[PDB]
Design a binder for these strands. Structure first.
Ligand SMILES: [Mg+2]
Ligand SMILES: [Mg+2]
Lengths: 49, 238, 119, 57
RNA sequence: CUCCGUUGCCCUCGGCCGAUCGAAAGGGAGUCGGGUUCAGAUCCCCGAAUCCGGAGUGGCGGAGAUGGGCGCCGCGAGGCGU
RNA sequence: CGGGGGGGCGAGCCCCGAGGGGCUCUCGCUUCUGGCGCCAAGCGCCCGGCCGCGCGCCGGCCGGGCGCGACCCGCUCCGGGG
């Protein structure tokens, strides 16, 4: 993303609720490889991304 | 086997992230437009705040058992409809110039409708009963009336529905109503209500006049504040 | 109990009626001003137009400037009981719309010149 | 070919005749196949191991 | 009034994202040889083309699509019943 | 969401009869792999027609409708201040 030191990452989840696919833009944590599943939320496990 | 083997089950599971969620009713998770949101949280404030006695009395009201006798009683007694009016005049025009007519008849006793009609004939002690609607919009217009009614010693009462009170008199709405006289035969039922009403109203005033009526929180807040008194009870009741 | 599946309120779609006007709002309908005598003003008789009639089976017309081709076509047809293959319009520097009208092959320009009086 | 041109062309010029034909590139379909086993099968292997964990417990 | 069309209402489904303008150089389907004028020419004409839209009643071909089985009758090509 | 209430695989405690019950937790169930996942199956309960038994909420055929599935109630659309 121009004018910005960090690279972004597009991460496609899917809407838990409408048949579709929400996509977002997380600031890439270092070690985000492409092809990672990224777990999100309260019960999520403690690792990178 | 009257059961073709193919029709199976395919039972879905809507846990988080499992199969996609179905359609619940959401009426609390929906976007209530600016009239609704607003009218919704008038009714809330109007319980949340500490409401005054004079405005409280406009909650406590009659019950089915009493109300329905009242609205029975009035139904002998509603002021002449239009059309029904015309033949009161038209019949006297034919009866005058035919078979005698001094033409006072006897004006049969009827209701009395509006406020600045009622309040005069309450300030004149010319009323057996007064019915007042609770929900009246500027409450201004009927704040006093109870106070006034009990000072004159006139049985007042607070019925639900300015609509159904304003349906006796043939209109959209009405705030007050009154029986000044009654038909002789119909006086046992009137004096039956009157004594039943004013045990419950006119002879209460220092219970009504000093009862603030809101100061009630939200059940979400109450459930939490009470859940801390099971913490504080069960700290040193155990 | 007609449950809300969606968490928006969208306005209810109401009935909405059709104009049933109590009068007409102007008395009469305006008389049509682009006619089969008005849309064509005059045929040209310029040498580069006689040359165009005789050689290309056309007729060169000055035409009312708000005219379309399907108006110029159902004009020229209506009048010089003709029929028209295609119309082809420009605006002279002067504001006069020309329109040179190819007439179907069965049918001659050099005759229909003398009928309309040009030549 | 420039995309509006596709409207002129015939169906068969725009795909190849398969699953995910003309959107996906063989090499990824034939992994999408044999991924779509092994996701499916190893829900069955976890399904029975779960069933044996609750039969034990 | 067949069937189709059209409309009326009743039920059913639809996230969006901003009333609108902004390219003669950005995005944007499809036209080119030859001929022709004093001046115009992918413009006119001759011939070759091409895109978009319409084609309903469907204009006409071709695909869908023309097996197999079983059972008879026929020399056999074959015919019929299912 | 907050309360409530189902569930129940399971843990603590309490009870217990050893069947089980209560209170507490937990869940509310998707983590090895660029895989698939909507418009509902299943059960239930009804009604229209049509066909068969003939008593026809018996049975078939055709065609619909509602309940659970997908706990119930509310009073602030969720969050943070004050
Ligand atoms: Mg524009
Ligand atoms: Mg351009």
């Amino acid at each position: 993303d121009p004018g910005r030191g960090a690279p972004l990452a597009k991460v496609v989840f899917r809407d838990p609720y409408r048949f579709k696919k929400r996509t977002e833009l997380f600031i890439a944590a270092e070690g985000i490889h492409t092809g990672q599943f990224v777990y999100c939320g309260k019960k999520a496990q403690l690792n990178i991304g | 086997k009257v059961v073709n083997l193919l029709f199976e089950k395919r039972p879905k599971n809507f846990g988080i992230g499992q199969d996609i969620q179905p359609k619940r009713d959401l009426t609390r998770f929906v976007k209530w437009p600016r009239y609704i949101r607003l009218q919704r949280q008038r009714a809330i404030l109007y319980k949340r705040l500490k409401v005054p006695p004079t405005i409280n009395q406009f909650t406590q009201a009659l019950d089915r058992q009493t109300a329905t006798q009242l609205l029975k009683l009035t139904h002998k007694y509603r002021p002449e409809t239009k059309q029904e009016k015309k033949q009161r005049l038209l019949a006297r025009a034919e009866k005058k110039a035919a078979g005698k007519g001094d033409v006072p008849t006897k004006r049969p006793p009827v209701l009395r409708a509006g406020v600045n009609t009622v309040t005069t004939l309450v300030e004149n002690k010319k009323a057996q009963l007064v019915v007042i609607a609770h929900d009246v919009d500027p409450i201004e217009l009927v704040v006093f009336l109870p106070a006034l009614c009990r000072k004159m010693g006139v049985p007042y009462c607070i019925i639900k529905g300015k609509a159904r009170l304003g349906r006796l008199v043939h209109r959209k709405t009405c705030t007050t109503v009154a029986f000044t006289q009654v038909n002789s035969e119909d006086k046992g039922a009137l004096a039956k209500l009157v004594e039943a009403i004013r045990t419950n109203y006119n002879d209460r005033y220092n219970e009504i006049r000093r009862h603030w009526g809101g100061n009630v929180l939200g059940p979400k807040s109450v459930a939490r504040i009470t859940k801390l008194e099971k913490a504080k009870a069960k700290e040193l009741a155990t | 109990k007609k449950i809300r599946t969606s968490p928006t309120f969208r306005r209810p779609k109401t009935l909405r009626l059709r104009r049933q006007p109590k009068y007409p709002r102007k008395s009469a309908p305006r008389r049509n001003k682009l006619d089969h005598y008005a849309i064509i003003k005059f045929p040209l008789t310029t040498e580069s137009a006689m040359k165009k009639i005789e050689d290309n089976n056309t007729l060169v017309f000055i035409v009312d400037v708000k005219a379309n081709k399907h108006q110029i076509k159902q004009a020229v047809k209506k009048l010089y009981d003709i029929d028209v293959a295609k119309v082809n319009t420009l605006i002279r520097p002067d504001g006069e719309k020309k329109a040179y009208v190819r007439l179907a092959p069965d049918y001659d320009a050099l005759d229909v010149a003398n009928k309309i009086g040009i030549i | 070919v420039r995309p509006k041109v596709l409207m002129r062309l015939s169906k068969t010029k725009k795909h190849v005749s398969r699953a995910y034909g003309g959107s996906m590139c063989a090499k990824c379909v034939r992994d999408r196949i044999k991924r779509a086993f092994l996701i499916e099968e190893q829900k069955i292997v976890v399904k029975v191991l779960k069933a044996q964990a609750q039969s034990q417990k």
